Amino acid sequence: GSMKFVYKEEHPFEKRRSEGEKIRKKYPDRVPVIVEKAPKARIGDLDKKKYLVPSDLTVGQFYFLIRKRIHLRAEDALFFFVNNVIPPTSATMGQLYQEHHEEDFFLYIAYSDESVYGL
């Protein structure tokens, strides 16, 4: 029901906040994004979970660079989730990060083939 990530359970909070502070201090024009498949999601997998994405890209454009990485089969859908909410495709990644970043300085996005998280 609520955004549960494996990356948060694999690495402690001192460690993440320190990596996030550094990666923000190193690649300022990009925002660090952790991307994981939501529970119960019937859909392809991502090799990597860690992505530095430019601040100026919209969510729409992101749905699309990811759609390529997973390659959706016929009548698969692809939805995003940040804090249990589908991000408007009009928003940018910089605004999404500003508005939704966890305090380890990472932005967390779950993806699913369903429009409701964990369904």
């Binding site: 660090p32 860690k50 990811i66």
Partner: peptide, 7 residues
């Protein structure tokens, strides 16, 4: 470790 998107 981090993948740049787009590179």
């Amino acid at each position: 470790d981090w993948d740049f998107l787009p590179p």
